[PDB]
Write a protein that binds this ligand. Structure first.
Ligand SMILES: C[C@]12CCc3c(ccc4cc(O)ccc34)[C@@H]1CCC2=O
Ligand SMILES: C[C@]12CCc3c(ccc4cc(O)ccc34)[C@@H]1CCC2=O
Lengths: 124, 124
């Protein structure tokens, strides 16, 4: 469980969101992992709940892009990125910072997505 | 304790590091706050320990800059930035992502600085 590996996992995650690859996303998580997004809302725990959450997230085609280098140290990674989508002619860009914590096996045991209304950038 | 306030606190923090303003930094924290930087190392707790930690951080003049919008939601903020300094003719730029959690009073109760060796950018 190295910085190289954690950075790679972040890149796999971004790419799988772009591809709508739900298996690929869920495969990154430990069986008892938790996901909390946005920070503040009630977390989802376990493979089944995690899959359901990302299924709802992938209803629309997402364009996802890392916007800076990944920060990876010890057993944690943080990264800045954008998620862009379009609905009823409005394009929206959401710019979160995510935090992953990894277990010794290199699977994500916790994901937290930090973004507020000021990080949601959309026209009329 | 609003996103506006948390964003302002982040901006006050960045500016106080630039100014070497140790009082200004410590004033942002709750009396029993913790600081952990880099993530992984042993955290420091309490006003006295927090001041000592930032005193050591301010031995050299720091140039600190937010490099993206702050992410602020509920009681937490995350931000991407750089800390630049020079020593013995070598310029170094460190690019962390910090996470703050706030108490109801609007003081920082926990700070975590996430950066690894790949986020330390220095010449020979
Ligand atoms: C962008 C988004 C809010 C956050 C978000 C979405 C999808 C995948 C995400 C993946 C993340 O790691 C962090 C945040 C999101 C939603 C899809 C529609 C929407 O409003
Ligand atoms: C940049 C640095 C490592 C991280 C760091 C420093 C100083 C203030 C910081 C403030 C932060 O919120 C996060 C990280 C740092 C150090 C000064 C010298 C050095 O190597």
């Amino acid at each position: 469980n190295t910085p190289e590996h954690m950075t790679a996992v972040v890149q796999r995650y971004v790419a799988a969101l772009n591809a709508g690859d739900l298996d690929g996303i869920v495969a990154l998580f430990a069986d008892d992992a938790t996901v909390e997004g946005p920070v503040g809302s009630e977390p989802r725990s376990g493979t089944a709940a995690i899959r359901e959450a990302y299924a709802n997230s992938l209803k629309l085609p997402l364009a996802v892009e890392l916007t800076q280098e990944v920060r990876a140290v010890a057993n944690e990674a943080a990264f800045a990125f954008t998620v862009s989508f379009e609905y009823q002619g409005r394009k929206t860009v959401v710019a979160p910072i995510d935090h992953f914590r990894f277990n010794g096996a290199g699977k994500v045991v916790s994901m937290r997505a930090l973004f507020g209304e000021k990080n949601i950038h959309a026209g009329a």
